[PDB]
Structure formats: structure tokens, C-alpha cells
Amino acid sequence: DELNLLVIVVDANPIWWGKQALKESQFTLSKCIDAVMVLGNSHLFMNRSNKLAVIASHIQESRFLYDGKYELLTSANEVIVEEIKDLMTKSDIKGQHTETLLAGSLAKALCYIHRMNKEVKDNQEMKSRILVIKAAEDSALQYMNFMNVIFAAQKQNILIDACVLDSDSGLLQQACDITGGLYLKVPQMPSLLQYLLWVFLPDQDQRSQLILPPPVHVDYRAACFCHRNLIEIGYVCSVCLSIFCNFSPICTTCETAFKIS
Template identity: 30%
Template sequence: MDAISDRVFTETTSTETSNDDPSLLTVILDVSPAGWYRIRDQTSIDELAKSLLVFMNAHLSLNNSNQVAFIASTPQKSKFLFPNPEIDYDEIRTSSSSSGSASNQHQKTPTLVSKDMYRQFRVVDEAVLEELNVVFDEIANGIQDINNNSTLSGALSMALTYTNRMLTLDQSISTTTASAINSTTSMGAGSGSGNTATNSSTSNPSNSITSMKSRILIVTANDEDDVKYIPVMNSIFAAQKMRTSIDIAKLGFEDSSYLQQAADATNGIYFHVHDPRGIVQTLTSAFFIEPSIRPFIILPTNSNVNYRASCFVTGKSVDIGFVCSVCLCIMSKIPPSGKCPACESVFDEKIIAQLSKGPSVLSKKKRKIDTNGAAK
């Protein structure tokens, strides 16, 4: 936590009142085998999964209305581990509360889960661990073709889609609640005394309505900067519109420039965990703070954000390249077709000829020397 030692304490004033609104936490775990193999001497993915479950349970314990989601990003696909649409969690809660059939139905319960655990914790832990073991078995048995492509951008899109659905559902519930409050208060307003207090509550019904907050946490150990630039930028713009912060817990030895941009653009936290053996302490300190109260907390900052873009043709990051004047497409080289790969605008042949010219070295004029040895 040395990154927060140089911060200066400043007094800030807040115009918003503190609230206890429910929050949605979506965790994305990148399980690419290559990245975890490099840090096999420091930690294992099993230990990290247990630390993430502790972090998610702590989030659920803050408010009984808090929600969590868990997505695994494999080299082949992205998959929801929790909630799983194919599983009815109400039946799990009912069967876990029963005494007779619970022992028969939960014989495969991991040792991490105990009988004295809070019901919501148990449902989340069992679902995540069982689905994560299935993902590991698929990778180990070769069911999923291991390649160098990253599906982290797809997992981020899935997280934003689920977040948007939860926020829309919460908004519909809030609207229904507001209409019920308005109808109740309007009925009470016409009956005798208490009209002043009733009218005040009717004029501002939003004070009794809660709205769900959301944030995304990405945990990855992949040192290869192979994240697709265009889907990531689209996800960043969507997260900005939804006011969803994207936090990054980067393990491994190298930083990820695209994930740095995602955290910086969405007012999230980017933290490079050099020693993952104490990852649970890092999660509960650096990433546990809700975005609404982060202006009052000293958090780790990342001032060296790499804003390099990615080439639309090769997919690699570029420092110097060409930009389309129509759609601002970035290219490290001009396509042979002479068209923009994004908007298919035809480039001017004269401009292409000028840009294709190599660097030329101007020859210096030789100085004439007279018979006396003096230069003219």
C-alpha cells in the first residue's frame, strides 16, 4: 500500500447526503492458464478464488439488499458462474434449510462451506466453487481450445449487460413504489389533519426510494496486452453512461495499458498487486470502498496511465500511426486497398503517396577551400 503514502489530505464538501442504497458488485476473474502459470510460485487460482468469495461475502454483509455476480473469463469463452440462469436458487435455499434431505443433496459441498454459514453466503459460495471446478475440468481435459486470445472484453460486456438489466429492474421497482407512495399519501391528504406533512412527502417522493449502485472488479494475471481495444473502449463509454466504476486488480509482472484506461476513465481503481499472498487484505482495503464515498477516502492512485491506442488493422498498440479523417480510425500502416478498415472511406492517392515516402537525407553543401586554406 505504498502507493497511497504520498497522497495529501484535503478537506472536501459534499452536496449529496449519505444513503444506504443497495449495491451490485460484479467480479470478473480471468482464468487464462498462461498468466497464472507465471505466478505459480506466489499464489494459486484456488487461493485467489477463496479470497474473492470472502470479499463478496463482505459486500453482501453490508446490506441485505446487496447483490453480487461472478463471471469467469477463459481463453475460449466467458461464462456466468453466479447467478446461473439454469439453476433455481430458491430451491437451494429451501433444501439447505431442511434437515432431512439437505445432507443427501449437498454431499458434494466443499469444505469451505459450513452448516453454520449465512444462507446467502452458502448459496454464492457453492455456486461459484462448483462452476469454477467445472471450468477447470474443461480446460484440463482439453474441451476448451487454449489459445492466446483474450475474452476479457466479452466478459466486461456481459457484466455491463447484467448491470444494465439489474438497474432497469430496480428502476421499475422504484417507479412502482413511487406510484404506491403517491396514491397512499394522496388518499391520506384528504382526510382531516396532517395535511401539511402528507403534502410534503407527496411533493418529494424520491426521498423514500432507493436506487441501486453498481461497480465491476476485474482480477487478471495475464501479462499479454491482447485485450481487444474496440470492445473495451465501447464498454468504457457504456460504463461512463451508466456511472459504473471499473476496478482493476492486476497480478503478474506487467501492467495492462487498456485496463489502466478503463479504470481511469470510469473513476475506478487500478492497483498492481506485486505480492498476491495477501490479496484478501488488498481486496478488503483498496477495493471495498463504494464509489459514492471514495472522494473522502485515501485510495491508491495510478498517475502513469498509458493511453496508447490499438491499431484497427493489426490489433497491436501503436505510438505513432495514421488517423482516418472521417471516423478517426487509428492505423499503424496504410491498408493495401487504400480504404479505411472501419468506415471504408477511400483515401486520396496523392496523400498516400506522400505518406508512403521514406525519410530523405538532405546532402550538405561542401565548403570550398582556397589556396590559402581558408573556407569560403
């Protein structure tokens, strides 16, 4: 009855992969896509009850991806190969927006998980996990929506694993900490697939008996809005929850004067 859904989110920023191609490094985006497809094939391979949901997170929007080879696996891969080429051929950069729409893809994934869970037979239980791979820089404005996604996932108890390639993002660290997911940076991108298999592929119950790398320490410092500087103790607004390092009689954000005698 173990219905395990493995959600895959891909950092499809064209800028980072274009630069990497300019670097002519050992690892390319095609290798990342192949590794993702292999991981999904193995996930469906482990058990029939296991299901796969793959969504591509591109700057323009989020795309739902899904001869000696398994027929259903062959069809799924050719579908995915069709989807990625379809996106890339139509991938036109029109605008100065560079940050990946990380939050929106997560919201779409959560909605799909909810839809499938409603469709789950009541005789069976659906464990769901989301795997996200990080390549380009993190997004700044999506912080509120990212926190909302984290809160919703923790409410529905969905593990979220973040995989770092080049750029570390403390947001992903905190997300994995709160959600209980696994966070790790892979230095050898070509070896990356094994890190997915050795760590991300096993289920959390399986990971319990298995010996795992220790979790990375995560900080939760706060930046005071008037200068965005990290502090230890700060003054919090009782109205709009704004943080101020210096005592103020009037709040800047909610425009409320502090009634202190």
C-alpha cells in the same frame, strides 16, 4: 435504497495459473478464488440491499458463477465452488487462442447489470461497480470492443476497477481512468485479498473521505498504422480515421485518394 452491486470478473486463463503452479509460488489460483468468494461474502455482509454478481472469464467462454457459517453465504459459496470445479473439470484447451475473452465477459456483465437495473424497484437507486482482476497477458484484438464497453459503462456511469497481479495492461489503465475506477498492481499476491478490502471494497462515496493511494499516471500515445510506432503528431484520415505518419495521396484502409490540390 442504496442497491450496491459489486461485479467480479476473474482472469481464468489456465496458462498463467499452470505456469504459476509450475513455479510453486506462495500464491495459487485456489487462493484467488477463495479471496474473491470472501470479498463477495463481505459485500453481501455489509448490507442486505447490496447484491453480488460474479462471472468467471475463461478462455473457452464466460461462466456466470452467481457449520458456524451463514446459511445463505454457505449456499452461495457451495454454488460458486460447484461452478468453478465444473468449469475446470470441463476446461479443455482446444485451439491456439490464448488471450482471455475480456470484452465478452464485460459485455455479459453489462447486460446483467441492465437486466437487474430494469428489475430494480423505482423507490430505490442501484449503484453498480465492476471489479476485474488481471493475471495473464492482455488481449490485442479486443481493443475495439473494449473501448465500446468503456463507452457504454461511462454512458451508464459504472465504475470499473482493475486489479493487476503480474502483467500490467495499459488498456485497463485507460479503462479505469475513463470510468473513474481504481487501478493498482498487487506485488504480493498472497496479500492480495487485503488490497481488495482496503481499496476495492469501500464504496466511492466512502473512498472520498478516506485517504487513498494517488492514481497512477496514464498515457494516451497513438501508433501510426503503417508501422504501429508511437508518435506525437500524425496525419488522420478524414474518412476512416486512420493515422498515417507520412503524407499520402491515397488512404490505405478506406481506399480513398486524398483530394488535395
